[PDB]
Design a protein around this nucleic acid. Structure first.
Ligand SMILES: [Ca+2]
Ligand SMILES: [Cl-]
Length: 91
DNA sequence: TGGTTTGTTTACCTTG
DNA sequence: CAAGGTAAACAAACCA
C-alpha cells in the first residue's frame, strides 16, 4: 500500500531510464536492459528464466516503443539489435 | 527450416 | 479522462 507496484514506486519507463543512465555510454540493447532488470531490481532477481520473464519483458519492449523519451538507434554490427537511449529532446 | 527475438501497435483493466 | 501495467496480434530479422 506504500508502493505502487511490487518492485517499488518506479514505473517501467523509470526503470528503463535508470538502466540506460547506469551505462557509461548511456545506451543499451534490449537484452542488456533485461540483464540490468534481473541484476538490479530485487523483485526480478528470480523472474529471469524463460518461464516467468515473458510478461515483464513484453512490458519492457512495449514501453520502449510507446514512449518518445526513448529512441532507437541503428546497430548494424551485422545481426545486432538496436541501441536504446534517452531522447535528447526529452519525453 | 522452423522456432526465437526484437519491435510496433492496439486493446483491456484498474487507479486516482 | 489520463496513466500504467498487462496481454496479445503481427511481422521482420535472427539464429539454432
Ligand atoms: Ca519510442
Ligand atoms: Cl515491424
Amino acid at each position: 500500500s506504500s508502493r505502487r507496484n511490487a518492485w517499488g514506486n518506479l514505473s517501467y519507463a523509470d526503470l528503463i531510464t535508470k538502466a540506460i543512465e547506469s551505462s557509461a555510454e548511456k545506451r543499451l540493447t534490449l537484452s542488456q536492459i533485461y540483464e540490468w532488470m534481473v541484476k538490479s531490481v530485487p523483485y526480478f532477481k528470480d523472474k529471469g528464466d524463460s518461464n516467468s520473464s515473458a510478461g515483464w519483458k513484453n512490458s519492457i519492449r512495449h514501453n520502449l516503443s510507446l514512449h518518445s523519451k526513448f529512441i532507437r538507434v541503428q546497430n548494424e554490427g551485422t545481426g545486432k539489435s538496436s541501441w536504446w537511449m534517452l531522447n535528447p529532446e526529452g519525453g
